[PDB]
């Protein structure tokens, strides 16, 4: 035995940064997208989702990297000075911005990153922030149980396999700069890298296209292709 399995380890399997979200933030004269709130999850994309759903439970420290790409929108010769983007983390319960100049942007206790355009992509790390002892990719249950004494069925009605409505909060991204006379549109791509990963209860990989945050399937349910029984 001289061939090794260093690259098949769980840490190596997730050691790549996967894009999990693209957020559009526009700066223009203040129906608008001057600030964008994105709920944190890996299920907006399939690749990392499929890799993680190889297992039932996980525990990993995350690393987020933000790549910002700005462009003009129908500019004739209108130009702009280098922009600064504010990415504020809003955990469940904290107030959420209602405008791009709201008081919530003060970031007194909410962590925030101020990224200057043209610099290196903004990278930070997060520890395991799970309420339980491990993350639950699959939850075979509800959060509310409808009881006999409930006045109406909606009291106990809950989404299947949904644990909490506000899983880990949102990221609110704005352009701190005031509006230039010409519109500037930017895309922030968030790349998520698990680290120190531990996994439990392996599961078969998804074989059909994802349909929503659950195991629901709707279309393209015939994956295997035609092949002769005795054809090599």
């Amino acid at each position: 035995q001289r061939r090794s399995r260093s690259e098949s380890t769980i840490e190596s399997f997730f050691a790549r940064g996967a894009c999990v979200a693209i957020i559009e933030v526009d700066n223009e004269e203040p129906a608008q997208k001057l600030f964008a709130m994105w709920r944190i999850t890996y299920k907006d994309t399939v690749q990392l989702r499929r890799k993680l759903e190889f297992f039932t439970y996980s525990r990993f420290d995350m690393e987020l990297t933000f790549v910002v790409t700005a462009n003009f929108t129908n500019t004739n010769n209108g130009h702009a000075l280098n922009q600064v983007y504010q990415i504020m983390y809003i955990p469940p319960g904290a107030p959420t911005p209602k405008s791009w100049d709201d008081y919530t942007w003060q970031t007194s206790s909410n962590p925030s990153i101020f990224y200057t355009y043209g610099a290196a992509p903004a990278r930070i790390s997060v520890p395991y922030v799970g309420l339980a002892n491990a993350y639950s990719h699959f939850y075979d249950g509800f959060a509310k149980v409808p009881l006999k004494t409930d006045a109406n069925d909606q009291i106990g009605d809950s989404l299947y396999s949904a644990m909490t409505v506000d899983d880990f909060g949102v990221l609110a991204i704005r352009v701190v700069n005031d509006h230039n006379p010409t519109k500037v549109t930017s895309k922030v791509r968030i790349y998520m890298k698990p680290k120190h990963v531990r996994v439990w209860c392996p599961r078969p990989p998804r074989a059909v296209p994802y349909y929503g945050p659950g195991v629901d399937y709707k279309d393209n349910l015939n994956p295997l292709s035609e092949k002769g029984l005795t054809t090599y």
Partner: protein, 235 residues
């Protein structure tokens, strides 16, 4: 000189970072500290302090001094509860604005046992028994004494002791609960009932008021600092 490689994240300002910075006033002779009474080393020390609960939040009683008083009486309906509130120490209106709740609303997660102290402020000639019950979540919220009896509970004799301490132990599926209304991290319910009655003699007030206080125990802990929703600024 020394070859270096600029890693991603360079030239960013993270408000939670811990980096050394140049001093704008070097060689400054700072005033030495003194032993001022009341030094605080942790924020949970404040939460451990009992503070009165706005138990009554009716339209004509909230945002007054009557919102801290719960009326007890000998003429009350012994079948109905005295007071009832969910065990949400940061989202429940009666607990959100308490000192404990104020400290919690700066954090996303909380875990620990609570302590509710109920003080009877009637006459010394008034006597009675009160059943104070905590029901863990999962079942119907106790609407009767026969139900609240089945959960954790304590009987409080008004004549003997004017204050009762109902300790709610930490019993949770998750290691930490959220400081926001969530049916998955629901904490339970707290209810109060008349065990026997309030009995008063003649020439005594037949209606009295009780006060409620809430505190955190030494096992209490919070996690993931955040911004409170209580304070806002017009922009």
């Amino acid at each position: 000189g020394l070859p270096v490689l600029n890693t991603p994240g360079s030239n960013q300002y993270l408000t939670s970072d811990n980096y050394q910075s140049p001093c704008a006033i070097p060689e400054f002779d700072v005033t030495p500290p003194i032993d001022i009474p009341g030094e605080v080393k942790n924020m949970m020390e404040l939460a451990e302090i009992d503070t009165m609960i706005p138990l009554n939040l009716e339209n004509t009683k909230r945002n007054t001094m009557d919102m801290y008083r719960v009326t007890l009486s000998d003429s009350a309906d012994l079948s109905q509860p005295i007071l009832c509130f969910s065990l949400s120490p940061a989202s429940d209106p009666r607990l959100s604005h308490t000192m404990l709740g104020e400290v919690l609303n700066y954090y996303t997660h909380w875990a620990g046992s609570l302590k509710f102290t109920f003080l009877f402020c009637g006459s010394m000639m008034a006597t009675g028994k009160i059943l104070v019950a905590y029901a863990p979540p999962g079942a119907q919220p106790p609407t009767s004494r026969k139900e609240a009896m089945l959960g954790t509970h304590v009987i409080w004799d008004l004549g003997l002791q004017s204050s009762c301490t109902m300790v709610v132990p930490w019993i949770s599926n998750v290691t930490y609960r959220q400081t926001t209304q969530d049916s998955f991290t629901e904490g339970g319910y707290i209810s109060m009932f008349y065990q026997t009655r309030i009995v008063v003699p003649l020439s005594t007030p037949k209606s009295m008021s009780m006060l409620g206080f809430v505190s955190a125990c030494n096992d209490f802990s919070v996690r993931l600092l955040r911004d409170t929703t209580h304070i806002s600024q017009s922009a």
